[PDB]
């Protein structure tokens, strides 16, 4: 894969890897970790104020190519934060790995740039519950509330959904055909914070879909308190 001009690397792996050798000039970042509750227009604007922080703080500024082993959630969640904070990016899952030499961490002087959310990247709850077409990409016994995680109250899913599990997105030839979705067509995709879903995301786009990411995800839908089957 070739990379873009004066890119920003970011290294979504754990810690340890990352010291034990990571790209030139590479920050360490995995926004795995944070839950939001995206309802009100403070709190999308607080996610983008957060963004901001974080993009100076990293000294952060298009183009920025973030790279992991393989397409993993980690990779994909953090990626779609920052693109999702106006940022240009680009995942790179394989062929860095001869370039990750260096051990000291750098310490970048905060860049002035300015977060600016691309909500039409996203979906908010409300969005996700009045989609025509909602991909609940996590396994199947999840979506059929036999299991969940400890943080969430009870198994279930969002009414109307449709199963996609993460897998299928991982053999992109003929994945369109097999989900029947064609180019241009808007479709959601949810989980549980938004991390496999993450990767439906980047996979469907590049696919030419319209895919957007319910980043409040299933355990948003429970604490809130909207209706879920079974
Ligand atoms: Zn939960």
Redesign the pocket.
């Known amino acids: 894969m070739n990379l873009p001009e004066d890119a920003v690397l970011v290294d979504t792996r754990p810690r340890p890897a990352y010291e034990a050798g990571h790209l030139p000039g590479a920050r360490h970042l995995d926004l795995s970790a944070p839950?939001l509750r995206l309802r009100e227009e403070a709190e999308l604007k607080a996610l983008e104020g957060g963004l901001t922080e974080l993009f100076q703080t990293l000294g952060l500024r298009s183009p920025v190519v973030l790279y992991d082993e393989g397409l993993t959630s980690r990779l994909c969640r953090t990626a779609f934060f920052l693109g999702l904070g106006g940022l240009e990016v680009q995942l790179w899952t394989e062929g860095w790995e001869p370039y990750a030499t260096e051990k000291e961490e750098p310490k970048p002087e905060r860049t002035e740039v300015v977060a600016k959310l691309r909500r039409d990247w996203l979906l908010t709850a409300d969005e996700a519950a009045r989609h025509p077409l909602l991909l609940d990409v996590r396994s199947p016994e999840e979506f059929q509330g036999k299991v969940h995680?400890p943080?969430?109250p009870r198994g279930g899913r969002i009414p109307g959904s449709k199963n996609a599990p993460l897998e299928l997105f991982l053999s992109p030839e003929g994945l369109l055909e097999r989900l029947g979705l064609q180019p241009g067509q808007e479709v959601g995709v949810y989980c549980?914070?938004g991390a496999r879903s993450a990767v439906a995301f980047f996979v469907l786009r590049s696919l030419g879909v319209r895919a957007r990411n319910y980043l409040g995800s299933?355990?948003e839908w429970?604490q809130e308190g909207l209706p879920t089957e079974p």
Do not use: N, R
Request: glycine share 0%.
């Open positions: 839950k995680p943080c969430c549980h914070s299933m355990h429970l």
